[PDB]
Amino acid sequence: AYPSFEAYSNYKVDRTDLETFLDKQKEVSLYYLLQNIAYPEGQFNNGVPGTVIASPSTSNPDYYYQWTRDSAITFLTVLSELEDNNFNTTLAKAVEYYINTSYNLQRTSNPSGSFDDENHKGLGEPKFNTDGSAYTGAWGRPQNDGPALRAYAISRYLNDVNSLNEGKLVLTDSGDINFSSTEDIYKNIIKPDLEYVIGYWDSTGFDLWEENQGRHFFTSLVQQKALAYAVDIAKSFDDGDFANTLSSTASTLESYLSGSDGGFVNTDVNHIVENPDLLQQNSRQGLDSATYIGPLLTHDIGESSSTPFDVDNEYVLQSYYLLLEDNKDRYSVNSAYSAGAAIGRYPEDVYNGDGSSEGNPWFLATAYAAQVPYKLAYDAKSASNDITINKINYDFFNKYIVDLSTINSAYQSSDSVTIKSGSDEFNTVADNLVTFGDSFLQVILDHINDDGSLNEQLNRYTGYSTGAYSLTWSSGALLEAIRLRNKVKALA
């Protein structure tokens, strides 16, 4: 049951036209995203302001909780909307309420620990109840991606306040808020999460799927990004010694991510191994949609990101191709798709959205899979950068994008093919990347509920929606796909 849910009234998806669907859904999915955020001006005006529910599903399954990860990822979508529009003050108020609630949750003792523990050990706690109290039941704790994604989101709001709102906050003359300046947010809310990541990046915790403990590519990547991005924030508040702590730590984590201690880059299999400890146990072989979701979250197109493992990395793109090819054979629903297809979490998954049997494809994974080729095209065309295709990725490009012997007849004798910006083949490759990305959004249009809401999962046989209803992260993933598609279609 999902008692709180309110459909977008008298809307029904049009399944006959992708273009019309994406134009309309841009508004519809934002309505469903904002419905799950408490803020006085919103639909969810009875919750504690700044609370993000993962889903209105309160049973079968029960996802009516606030997780640090889903709240942060939700607000990266809110931030993109704030950046693209006029620093809309309604949306900015919602971000400041989330910053305030985040301050309170940081200071809430829970089963992971408390704020006064070494390097604020309680900040690894994955989820809290909707009234802001601790979740005391057994859970896969800690999860060390959450404080990194929260630190990145709130850092990014400070950069936008400085650049779009002349350095001013929107909730300054309010008595309900626990900060009165950008420096207060940095010292009191951003720094404590970056201290957590400095203290605990080389420590064991649970992955983003909340299932296994050990080394995880996504977790380390989103930590590296939070630290790197915060360097210039810290400098701006005259926190120079901490800036250089962050710089040094970010470089150290970069080396860990790309070396044999981390174990994620596996040149025996030539793809990323998302969870290397489960490869040692022989329990999973390493393919996971988290391998390309992390790259996408950590390289927003509106930044000039230094951080490693963008989606043009050969081992990330090989994990993406090999998961695609797995899922096209694995899920019967995908028999009528010849390009993109419905994608799940990892090939070994047994979670069926409300128990264990056989895993299913996920709407969020499918929406991120559209973003991979959209970003490859956008990064080339927007900047007039050449496209360089490494030999490990030739099979992917020949099967789905372009025949590489039509570009260079001797390509199999070289280690890479470089397609030059401006050339006719470059325009073909970029348009074919976009059309490939659209094929994943066509899968979503085939199987979305008629009311425009997105569940967590779609059944592997039929494609009918299943699991948690109107999952906030699903809505967000589709909104970011539509955003990237409109940005690259505006260049042609």
Swiss-Prot record:
It holds the Pfam family Glyco_hydro_15. Glycans are attached at N88, N100, N178. The active site is at D207 (proton acceptor), E210 (proton donor). The keyword Disulfide bond does not apply. Keywords: Carbohydrate metabolism, Glycoprotein, Glycosidase, Hydrolase, Polysaccharide degradation, Signal. The keyword Magnesium does not apply. GO terms for biological process: polysaccharide catabolic process. One of its GO terms (cellular component) is fungal-type vacuole. Substrate binds at W139. This is Glucoamylase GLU1. It comes from Saccharomycopsis fibuligera (Yeast). The gene is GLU1.
